[PDB]
Structure formats: C-alpha cells, structure tokens
Design a protein around this ligand. Structure first.
Ligand SMILES: [Zn+2]
Ligand SMILES: [Zn+2]
Lengths: 197, 197
DNA sequence: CGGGCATGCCC
DNA sequence: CGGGCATGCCC
C-alpha cells in the first residue's frame, strides 16, 4: 500500500485534459505557463487559473481534486506542506495546506488519515454554454524556495477527476514553480532546455 | 519609558571592553571578526567566542547580559527573535531566543515582561591567572536572511556588565551577520567600505 | 517596470 | 575547499 500518489497522465474515457491561459511577457508576470516544460511559473498567494477540458460530460457528483507531490525521487515520499513562516502568519483552508481554491462555495480540504497528504477538492461543474472548458482558480501559499517548506524542491500538481463513488475518471499533472519572477524564470529554463537539455 | 535599549558604548569605571579571536582566511570560516567594521560574521548554530576585558575587577555577583537589537532606525523598535522554522525544529533555551550561551552551568534566559525583549545572562567570572580576559561562547540560532526572523535586517549584539543590584557597570556592542560564508561576506563588505564608503 | 546585486547552496 | 549560479529583493 504505497503512500505516493500516481502522477501518470490518465485522460480516461471522458477525455480529460488541462488548459492554461496565455500571459504577458513581463519579468514578474503573476502567472505564466510553459507548454514546452509542461510547467506553471507563478507568484505566491496569487491566482493560477487552470482550465478543465473534457470530450464527454462526467456524471453528476463528479469531483476535482488537486494535490502537490515532490518531483524528484529523493523527495517523492515526503508530504508537501506550507512552511512554518507562512503557516504562522496565515478561512476554510487549514494553515498547513499549500494549495487553496478561491471563489468556490463548496471547497473541501482533506488531510488523508493514512498517507497524511493534503488535497483540495471542488465539485466539477460543466461549462456554461458556448464555452469549451471550466476554470478553477488555484492559489499556492508558499514560494518554492521557502525554508522548512518546499525548500527549493520542484513539485508537481496532480489534478484528478473523480466520481462521487471515488472511481478515478481522469488524471493530469503539471510542474509548478512558485517564485518572485515567473517571466524571468520561465525564459531562463526554456533557454537552458535549448542549450543544455 | 523607552522599550529600545541603549547601544551607546559605555566602558565605565571598570574599563570594560570586548575582544575577539583572529580567524582563518577561508571563504566559509565559522566565525570571523572585522575590526574596521566592528562586526562579527558567523555561521548559524556555531560558536562565537567573545572575550571580556576589564581594567578593574568587578564586584562579586556581577552578571554579563547579551541582547540583539535591529541596527536600522526603521526596525529598531521591533523585538529580535528566532524565525518560525528554526523555532519549530528546535535544553534551557526557549525556542524563540536567537542568542544562546554554550558551556555554562548558570545561564539564564529572560523574556522582559514590559519590553518583550530577549536576553541571555551568565555570571561574570574573573580570568584564571596569567590570562587577561574571560571568554563566553555565544551561539546565534538563525541566519540574518531567515524569513520571518531577522529577514535580512542587520542586528547589533549589546553586551552589558551589570552588578547583582542591577546597576549598569559597562556596555559594548558589535554588529553581527549570521551567514553561510562569513569569510566571503567579510571581504565583500570591507572592499565595499574601501571603494564606496 | 527591467537591471542587477547578495547570499544559500550546488551534487 | 573555492568557483559560480539561482533567486528574492533593492530603496
Ligand atoms: Zn512559505
Ligand atoms: Zn531561522
């Protein structure tokens, strides 16, 4: 019984995929996504819109869960949590949770009783009409560099689509780097990929 | 009734002054003192020997107190304390105290009931015989850069010599920078002083 | 807003 | 051990 959740992409029978908005070119843009690295660069405590795309409409009662895990093998089995500084100076969200959802009246924050991992869950809502996706506003409450938290360790966010019975319907993931200057750090990484990847 | 303790040098009638040991040239020497800047550069949680020199022998019951205060006017009135990370992962010393004394069976840690400032106190002991000074081993439990603690703000350590009745007998102070590479940072600062001081 | 320095750590 | 990069922030 592993305590490390799968990160394997599983688009499933509903054709579940993630979308991200294009952003500005600014050195310190608040949120920016790199398709080449499948990686979000964003600033702490600010909005990161993630779009949910499906080919088929999930059944009523379907839920959307987000959870962070460390990306490197050496840190994979350690629970991702808020650093003690940002925990201390911290409504519904427990202070130890890294990932929050804003703008949803039905958000649930879970602390797994066996694996101790944190996750945040909202109801899946189908797009309104004309629209092809549904947007969730996530918030990361620490910088990747936070001492006693992520401590410079890369993380993945895993988004899972789950029915009310608990069956996995779909899964996707993206890397996240919460940092002061997302535009600078995105360009630096893409350039490093080009020259020495 | 101010809550900012004096840092003014007061050598007093006993001729109280501080001494510091000369150290190596290494980039990451554990402790090194700059006479030009009256400034200690040291690594966290490691020994910083400070020598006490007097011209006249203090009376029995004399105490030696150390306390940190922020050096800049803008931060002067804020209590210097341990960051929440190093407080959490922390015998006699309360976890919130930045400055500890090692190797003394009579150490007292005080949290002032009116000003809320932290200090650590030991008995003054006169030099043994032949020696001209007495050494106290101090420990700083955070880096200057610790988020939620010093947060990159320069500090002074104020050493006061006090009689058992509480009269101030002498006072001296030095700046402290707790950092990963004290030798590098000392040379950088002395060079900056030379070129643009 | 982008340039550029200080500083912890690389693996 | 010293060189040198990443990254938060300068004031
Ligand atoms: Zn944090
Ligand atoms: Zn600290």
């Amino acid at each position: 019984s592993s305590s490390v959740p799968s990160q394997k992409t599983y688009q499933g029978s509903y054709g579940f995929r993630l979308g991200f908005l294009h952003s500005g070119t600014a050195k310190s843009v608040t949120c920016t996504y790199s398709p080449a690295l499948n990686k979000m660069f964003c600033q702490l405590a600010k909005t990161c819109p993630v779009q949910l795309w499906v080919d088929s409409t999930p059944p009523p009662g379907t839920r959307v869960r987000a959870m962070a895990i460390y990306k490197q093998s050496q840190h994979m089995t350690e629970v991702v949590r808020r650093c003690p500084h940002h925990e201390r100076c911290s409504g519904l969200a427990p202070p130890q949770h890294l990932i929050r959802v804003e703008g949803n009246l039905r958000v649930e924050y879970l602390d797994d009783r066996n694996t101790f991992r944190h996750s945040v869950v909202v109801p899946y809502e189908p797009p309104e009409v004309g629209s092809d996706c549904t947007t969730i506003h996530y918030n990361y409450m620490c910088n990747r560099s936070c001492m006693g938290g992520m401590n410079r360790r890369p993380i993945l966010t895993i988004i899972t689509l789950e029915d009310s019975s608990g069956n996995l319907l779909g899964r996707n993931s993206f890397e996240v780097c919460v940092c002061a200057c997302p535009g600078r750090d995105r360009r630096t990484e893409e350039e490093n990929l080009r020259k020495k990847g």
